[PDB]
Amino acid sequence: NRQRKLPEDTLAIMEKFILEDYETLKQKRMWEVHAALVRACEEAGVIAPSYKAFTKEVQRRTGYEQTKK
C-alpha cells in the first residue's frame, strides 16, 4: 500500500515547513520545527502529522543538499 495516508493540504504544509524552517542557517532541532508545524496546522484547520512522520521524511532528504543548506 504505497498510497499516502495523509491529506494533501497536510503534505503541502509539512513540505513547506521542512523547506523553510528546518533546512535553514539555524540548525534547529526536529522537535521545535514539528511543534511550529503543528501550531500552523492547527491554525489552518488541517491534520498535523506525528513526530515520527516528520523524522522519517527528514530522513528522506539527507545527502548533499540538506547538509549544504
Partner DNA sequence: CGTTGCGGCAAAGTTATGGGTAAAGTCACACGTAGTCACCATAATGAAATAAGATCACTACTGGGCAGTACCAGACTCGAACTGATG
> What residues line the site for DNA (CB under 7 A)?
1-6, 47-53
Residue number, 51 or 58, with CB nearest to DNA: 51
Q: Given the complex with DNA, which of 4 and 68 has the nearer CB atom? A: 4
Residue 53 C-alpha cell reads as: 512522520
What number of residues does the chain have?
A: 69
Give me the least distance between CB of 62 and DNA, in Å please: 16
Q: Which of 27, 21, 42, 69 shows the shortest CA–CA distance to 54?
A: 21
Through-space distance between the first and last CA atoms of the chain, rounded to whole angstroms = 33
From the CB of 24, what's the least distance to DNA, in Å?
18
Q: For residue 20, how many other CB atoms are within 10 A of its CB?
A: 10
With respect to DNA, which residue has the nearer C-beta, 5 or 68?
A: 5
Minimum distance of DNA from residue 67's CB (angstroms): 16
